[PDB]
Amino acid sequence: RLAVARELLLAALEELSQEQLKRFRHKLRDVGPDGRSIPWGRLERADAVDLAEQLAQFYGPEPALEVARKTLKRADARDVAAQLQERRLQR
Amino acid sequence: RLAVARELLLAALEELSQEQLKRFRHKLRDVGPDGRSIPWGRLERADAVDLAEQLAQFYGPEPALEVARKTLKRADARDVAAQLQERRLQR
Amino acid sequence: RLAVARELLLAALEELSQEQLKRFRHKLRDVGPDGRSIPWGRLERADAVDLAEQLAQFYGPEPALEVARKTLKRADARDVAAQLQERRLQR
Amino acid sequence: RLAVARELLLAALEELSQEQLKRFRHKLRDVGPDGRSIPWGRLERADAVDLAEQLAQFYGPEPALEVARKTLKRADARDVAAQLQERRLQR
Amino acid sequence: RLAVARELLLAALEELSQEQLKRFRHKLRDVGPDGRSIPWGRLERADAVDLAEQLAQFYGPEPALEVARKTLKRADARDVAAQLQERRLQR
Amino acid sequence: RLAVARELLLAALEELSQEQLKRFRHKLRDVGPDGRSIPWGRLERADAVDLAEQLAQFYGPEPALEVARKTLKRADARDVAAQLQERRLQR
Amino acid sequence: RLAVARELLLAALEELSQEQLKRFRHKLRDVGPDGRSIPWGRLERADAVDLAEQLAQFYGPEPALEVARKTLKRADARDVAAQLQERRLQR
Amino acid sequence: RLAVARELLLAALEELSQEQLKRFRHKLRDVGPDGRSIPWGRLERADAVDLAEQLAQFYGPEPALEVARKTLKRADARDVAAQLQERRLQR
Amino acid sequence: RLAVARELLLAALEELSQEQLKRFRHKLRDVGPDGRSIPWGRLERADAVDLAEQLAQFYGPEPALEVARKTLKRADARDVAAQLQERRLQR
Amino acid sequence: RLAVARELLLAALEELSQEQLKRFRHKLRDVGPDGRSIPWGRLERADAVDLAEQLAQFYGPEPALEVARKTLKRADARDVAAQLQERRLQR
Amino acid sequence: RLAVARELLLAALEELSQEQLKRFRHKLRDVGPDGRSIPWGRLERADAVDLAEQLAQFYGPEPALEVARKTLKRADARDVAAQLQERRLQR
Amino acid sequence: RLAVARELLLAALEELSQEQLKRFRHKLRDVGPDGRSIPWGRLERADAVDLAEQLAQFYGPEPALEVARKTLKRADARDVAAQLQERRLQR
Amino acid sequence: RLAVARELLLAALEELSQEQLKRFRHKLRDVGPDGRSIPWGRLERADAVDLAEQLAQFYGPEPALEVARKTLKRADARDVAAQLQERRLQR
Amino acid sequence: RLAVARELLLAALEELSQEQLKRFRHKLRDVGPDGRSIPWGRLERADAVDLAEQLAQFYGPEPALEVARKTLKRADARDVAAQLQERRLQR
Amino acid sequence: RLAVARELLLAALEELSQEQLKRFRHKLRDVGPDGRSIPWGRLERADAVDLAEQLAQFYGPEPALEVARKTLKRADARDVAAQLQERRLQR
Amino acid sequence: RLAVARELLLAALEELSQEQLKRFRHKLRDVGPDGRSIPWGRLERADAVDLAEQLAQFYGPEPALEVARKTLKRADARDVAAQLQERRLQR
Amino acid sequence: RLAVARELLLAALEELSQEQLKRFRHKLRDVGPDGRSIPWGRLERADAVDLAEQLAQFYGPEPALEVARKTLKRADARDVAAQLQERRLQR
Amino acid sequence: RLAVARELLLAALEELSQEQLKRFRHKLRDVGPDGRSIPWGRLERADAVDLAEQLAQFYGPEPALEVARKTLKRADARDVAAQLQERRLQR
Amino acid sequence: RLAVARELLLAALEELSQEQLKRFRHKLRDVGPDGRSIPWGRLERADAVDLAEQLAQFYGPEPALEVARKTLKRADARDVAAQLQERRLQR
Amino acid sequence: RLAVARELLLAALEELSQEQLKRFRHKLRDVGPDGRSIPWGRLERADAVDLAEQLAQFYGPEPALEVARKTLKRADARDVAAQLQERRLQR
Amino acid sequence: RLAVARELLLAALEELSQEQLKRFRHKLRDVGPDGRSIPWGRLERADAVDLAEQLAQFYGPEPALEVARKTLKRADARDVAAQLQERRLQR
């Protein structure tokens, strides 16, 4: 459902540390088909809950998990990204 | 019906945040066949309900959804626009 | 009939807002074959019922609907003009 | 009586906030058997007392409560609508 | 009696507002078997008492109530028209 | 006396605000033994002095105070109504 | 006197902060014998002086202090409410 | 009663911290039978008292506690939610 | 002809607004060879048709257009005065 | 003189701010020997010049300064009231 | 003289505003030794000059000033009444 | 000439704003040799053109400019008064 | 034509914001050959449609575009002024 | 006095360190007869002066010292609490 | 010229920040020969364009620059005041 | 003078830091003969210039320095208070 | 009670050393029925008091002791965990 | 086109950080041929979308890119300015 | 020029460290002829760019370099002050 | 002077080591006539420059040297205290 | 590409130790054609990721590698600089 799609993301986004969240927001503006990413103006001072808000709005909450897991492997946090993968199956 | 066509729009217009509504009114004066859009004088100080009024009057309430969903994808709010799409089928 | 021809117009004229009625009276003196329109002296301080009176007298109540619907599309009110169209068939 | 039927309505109409009254007048032109509603021309600039006047005249003061309570649930104000329901029994 | 038949009408005619009286005189020239109505020349500048005079003379004071109540429902004033109905029984 | 009976009323009628006077004229057509009240046609566009005129004529200036104080408590203005009560004793 | 009864209230009403005044207007519509309170329509956008106006009119200025002190204890402002109590004795 | 039903909610809503209130407003738009929740436009910039206002109006103050306690367990605040439960019994 | 000379004037005189007609009657008593103008006594309470009557009688209907167009440019209404000029050629 | 008596008042009345003028009109209906003050009906919607008109008419322009300075000290504006005092000597 | 007695009155009667003249005609039918005043039938639609005519005829022009100044103080216009007093000495 | 003397005044009178015209009519009844000014009864509801009419009649159109420029400096409008001064030389 | 000359102006006048319209009316009284501009009295409280009315009447609708485009560049709105220029060619 | 009661508290509240103030605000929501304490929403981001404000308002400034000294012993700061005790005697 | 005298002022008035404009309006009521300054009632809620309007009217547009530059040095904005000085020479 | 009395205060009020200004507004409502101080409603959200405005109005600008210096010693800012003392002598 | 349940925890949480607190926060995200633990984002920079806050909120203060004692044995601190056990009996 | 000219700018303006946007608005009032730049009054409190509005209006949307790229190199942001350059070619 | 005068300052102001900027703002309020310096209220929370703004406004941008270099030697930063000196010659 | 009085203190305060500054802030809250010292809340996290700020404000900069030298002897730093003594003579 | 140009830099910037990063930020403000380097204000408290941000913005991400490798040889870290060189070829 739509509600459990946001629940799964926000609980796998504030599992990041304060250091990884400085790296995860940095490692977010590189994905996209061709230049379709989130700009800095709504990312630089984003909190952990606020990041799970506009990531659910720019991509839509159903493929927001796939654009998060592709970057959580790329932000050097393979713990939560693999931990999200078994919990994406329990949707 | 005409009544459920306005009900579906106003509940999918005030689902926008206060920030997206500053961006959605800005991203509205670019659609049209050739220069047929809503001018600034009735858009700049429009509230969320007031925006669902004159958008229903300038285009007509039956294609007002299609000119809203085409811009909600363009105003970087793909959550509510996809959420409107399954509820346009329940008319 | 003549009575339902005026009933259909006056109920589709005071459906206009106070703002559209300032625009609808302005967008009325441009129609005509060649210069046959209603002058300002009997339009500037016309109420909503008073506008449905002399519009029924200058054109006749049977084609007063067609000169109203052609301008209601032109006064940026496509809600009531399309709503009049299905009710012109129920005459 | 007729006097307590208007007293009950006006005290349950200005219990609305200024925001709900912008939504309640908007959510009023959709009821009716088939197209029998109050037009915009006598609703757009209506005050809280003025709204309790012509709502008592268009429907009659005895079923004006039922057309108000059906819309107060629909204007997202279930506080006063349920509060009117126990006071409609004390007529 | 004839005297209480005019008393009941004039007290249910100046119960109309100034706005409804502009609508009630307009909604008067449509009744009739076939084209038997009151012309404009004795209606346009008629006061509230003056309207209760010639409405009592053109139809007769005994069926003047029935041609008034049929139009008071049609002039969007159902308050006084229903209020006249219980007082037509107390003749 | 008759002169101080009208002086006491008019100075306790224009002590009302502009908002209460919209509510006081509305809360006036409900009193009476059985249906003996002032109709709308001489109340809707009545000024503060004009209201103290026909209220003194329909009821008589000696019980016009009692029909005003009974409604000033009912129009949510208990300041002037209690202030009139100590000045009705100084007649 | 009546003048010092309003002076004591308005100087003990704008002693409230901007935060307490958002809480004091909220904590006002619960008092009453049975449902006799001030509605929202004249409270939501009331200033500090405007609140001392209609609180003096709905209750009367002599018991307006008692309905204010009973709520100032209830709006979590016991400073000014106890400070009003020694100044109600100096009337 | 209705008054103690709002008193119990507002004192169990501003017991939330500033951090939980950013999470509680986020965890509010997921409840409902099917899509009947409060939109963002009246939630994003809502204060603690303002949140206890429209939560009492959208659901009604009697089941507003049950839609708050179901989400206070879900917003990771089980202190106040269990503390509300023994105080819902003292109504 | 004489008939189309008055037809052209009256349709270009009630095209003036209510505000310009207060200015046009004021800007009329200044033309003339030497003091040959229309006095106030037959101008101050002149209607739009009545103004097209005595302007056709004091000057004659054939040069009444030239004394009207010289003042319509002077009464700050250059719309109708230029619009009369192409229609004076279609006589 | 009479002319400099009104000049001194109006230039010391619109020296008030917009906030003090809401307080100064409120602090005006308490002066008087016994109940001889200006009622609300000609004070509530009074402008700064309009307030210097009827204050000059109800009291007379020569003691209107003394009833203004006694209230300007009481409306918490001691700047202009002391500034008027040295300019009342330059009459 | 008789001529300067009417000159002094008419120039101190149209110094009244349009609002005071509605109050001054109302405050005129209360003076008299015992019931000797001007009736309504020649006062209700009296202009400012017309009021200075029959006030000079009912009382005589020499004591018409004293019955005007006694009421100009009573119609809440003490400006012109005191201004008449120094000009009654210059007769 | 007489015609350009009124043309210069009316174009320098409606150059005033709506606010200054409320102040300019107020600042007009103070000039004069000794008490020879225009009374209120023909000034209070005077329009901008109507003010240029009776100011040209009470003083005569040739010194009406000097009584206007002396007050336009006194009504705090030194823009148009200095602008009139160079255009009084081009008569 | 004359009709498309007013259509092009009014759609390029309410494209201005509410802020630019406060600047555009201010930047309008400076054009002219020598002192031939529109005065303040018909500009200060002019709406967006009302501004497109008297700008079409003072200059004539055919050169009203050139006096608007010369000022739209001067009112710091070069968007609509350049946008009008390609649409003046499509007349 | 009331002034020295707040002076004694604020000088014995910012004598706390930054560490004790994190512990003192935490050790504040446990006092009370039964559940009458200050909620988190006005305590979590309270400064040292701001804490001496609402502690003086929720309890009243006269027993605010006793609810502070009972908690200063409980927040492991017995230096200032004993130091306040000899200075509560010098009130 | 007069037009470039207002152009130079308004472009050197909205060069002020929002903070300096709160200080510049405050530092304006101290200049003058003896007490000839602009009162608060037309300064407190003045915008940047509105301030360049009445500063051009109270002083006249030709010495309005000198009363602005004398205060721009006094409102702690020496950037624009020196920048105006070289542009006053290019008039 | 009055102008240098406000100049000396505002330059000795914004010499306070942001921290002292939170303490100085708090340490202001304790002075007075007996309860004559400035309430919170016009102090809590007062800026540094705004504080120098109403402190000059409540006390008058000539003793506003003495009520400021008595509190600047009491708000733990003896730098500016002693610095004001040598500059009060240079008035 | 609830108060002694938090008192017992916070005094048995800051009995941990600085080294054990780096190990205790690490040994906290492993308990739970199935994945119901506290995430890193509110644990990594948590102080000793702050840890006793959200541990009391995520679990509730009554079973927060059992989830703390189960981990204090697991964080290699059996001193305080056994010391808490005899003090959990003295509740 | 005009629509893709604004799309390219706003997506290359909110790519700036919050720090660069404080520097970019500062580095904007220096360009121009000679003193033709945007003043502070419409720049100091401009958001990222609001900055892309009036930059498109003061310069026109077609050369607004060139005045933005010349300053983005000058505001020490060469990332987005070079990134805009390859996307200005894809217009 | 004026633009390179601000460019030279801001690039020689954020060359200061974070420690020197705490010392440079402190070492700024001592210069001046006699007491003409920048107060604390606009210096204490000033950023590096914000400091280069009001230092350019209080002194003017042309001698702002000389009041900066005199203090940069005094704030124990002789690196940038000597580095500014060779770049003040390249203006 | 005042400037050299702060210069002498700050250069004799950061001559302290990091260890003595932990002892000097501790040895500061014991001086005073009777309990007049600086509290902890503005001393515990004070830097070396920040300590020379509020020590100059609480005591005044002229006796701040004497309260510093009396404690520098008491904080076991007799080097700088004797070194300040010969430099207090060179003021 | 642009994305792999930043990926290569940030992974070759946090390969530096904590000691070399204190030396690398120091050895960065010496490169440039003539004085075009990054100032201290955005370098002194820059983290390893934050340094890879503004180094990519001041120079552009394509020559940011060349200004990093020229300084990594100069900051006595030839390990990563040679290791970057073979990975700049795999772009």
Side-chain angles (χ1 to χ4, degrees), chain H residues 41-53:
Chain H
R42 57 176 70 97
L43 284 194
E44 197 198 354
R45 323 161 314 86
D47 201 62
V49 159
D50 265 344
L51 208 57
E53 187 37 61

Side-chain angles (χ1 to χ4, degrees), chain A residues 30-88:
Chain A
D30 306 64
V31 300
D34 202 78
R36 194 210 151 192
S37 53
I38 308 183
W40 270 105
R42 57 176 70 97
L43 284 194
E44 197 198 354
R45 323 161 314 86
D47 201 62
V49 159
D50 265 344
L51 208 57
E53 187 37 61
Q54 40 207 320
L55 204 56
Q57 284 183 354
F58 185 77
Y59 292 103
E62 284 298 0
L65 303 169
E66 198 44 59
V67 86
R69 189 186 60 83
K70 271 180 55 199
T71 57
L72 278 175
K73 291 189 178 180
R74 218 168 73 199
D76 304 329
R78 266 172 174 86
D79 194 13
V80 47
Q83 196 268 333
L84 178 72
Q85 176 62 226
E86 96 172 316
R87 275 211 277 129
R88 200 165 68 175

Side-chain angles (χ1 to χ4, degrees), chain U residues 19-32:
Chain U
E19 177 48 54
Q20 291 144 246
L21 214 51
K22 199 184 184 185
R23 202 153 62 250
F24 172 66
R25 299 193 315 261
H26 195 105
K27 216 83 68 184
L28 189 45
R29 56 194 222 273
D30 306 64
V31 300

Side-chain angles (χ1 to χ4, degrees), chain F residues 28-42:
Chain F
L28 189 45
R29 56 194 222 273
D30 306 64
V31 300
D34 202 78
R36 194 210 151 192
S37 53
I38 308 183
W40 270 105
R42 57 176 70 97

Side-chain angles (χ1 to χ4, degrees), chain C:
Chain C
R1 220 162 70 254
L2 239 67
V4 84
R6 307 207 208 90
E7 277 285 344
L8 209 71
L9 167 68
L10 196 146
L13 209 66
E14 68 172 30
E15 203 78 26
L16 291 198
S17 142
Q18 193 267 342
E19 177 48 54
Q20 291 144 246
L21 214 51
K22 199 184 184 185
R23 202 153 62 250
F24 172 66
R25 299 193 315 261
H26 195 105
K27 216 83 68 184
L28 189 45
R29 56 194 222 273
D30 306 64
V31 300
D34 202 78
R36 194 210 151 192
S37 53
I38 308 182
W40 270 105
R42 57 176 70 97
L43 284 194
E44 197 198 354
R45 323 161 314 86
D47 201 62
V49 159
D50 265 344
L51 208 57
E53 187 37 61
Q54 40 207 320
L55 205 56
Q57 284 183 354
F58 185 77
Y59 292 103
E62 284 298 0
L65 303 169
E66 198 44 59
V67 86
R69 189 186 60 83
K70 271 180 55 199
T71 57
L72 278 175
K73 291 189 178 180
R74 218 168 73 199
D76 304 329
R78 266 172 174 86
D79 194 13
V80 47
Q83 196 268 333
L84 178 72
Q85 176 62 226
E86 96 172 316
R87 275 211 277 129
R88 200 165 68 175
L89 299 189
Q90 277 77 249
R91 78 277 197 187

Side-chain angles (χ1 to χ4, degrees), chain G residues 5-91:
Chain G
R6 307 207 208 90
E7 277 285 344
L8 209 71
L9 167 68
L10 196 146
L13 209 66
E14 68 172 30
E15 203 78 26
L16 291 198
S17 142
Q18 193 267 342
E19 177 48 54
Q20 291 144 246
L21 214 51
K22 199 184 184 185
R23 202 153 62 250
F24 172 66
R25 299 193 315 261
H26 195 105
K27 216 83 68 184
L28 189 45
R29 56 194 222 273
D30 306 64
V31 300
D34 202 78
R36 194 210 151 192
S37 53
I38 308 182
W40 270 105
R42 57 176 70 97
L43 284 194
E44 197 198 354
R45 323 161 314 86
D47 201 62
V49 159
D50 265 344
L51 208 57
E53 187 37 61
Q54 40 207 320
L55 204 56
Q57 284 183 354
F58 185 77
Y59 292 103
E62 284 298 0
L65 303 169
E66 198 44 59
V67 86
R69 189 186 60 82
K70 271 180 55 199
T71 57
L72 278 175
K73 291 189 178 180
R74 218 168 73 199
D76 304 329
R78 266 172 174 86
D79 194 13
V80 47
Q83 196 268 333
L84 178 71
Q85 176 62 226
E86 95 172 316
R87 275 211 277 129
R88 200 165 68 176
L89 299 189
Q90 276 77 250
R91 78 277 197 187

Side-chain angles (χ1 to χ4, degrees), chain O residues 17 54 59:
Chain O
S17 142
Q54 39 208 320
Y59 292 103

Side-chain angles (χ1 to χ4, degrees), chain E residues 56-68:
Chain E
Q57 284 183 354
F58 185 77
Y59 292 103
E62 284 298 0
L65 303 169
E66 198 44 59
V67 86

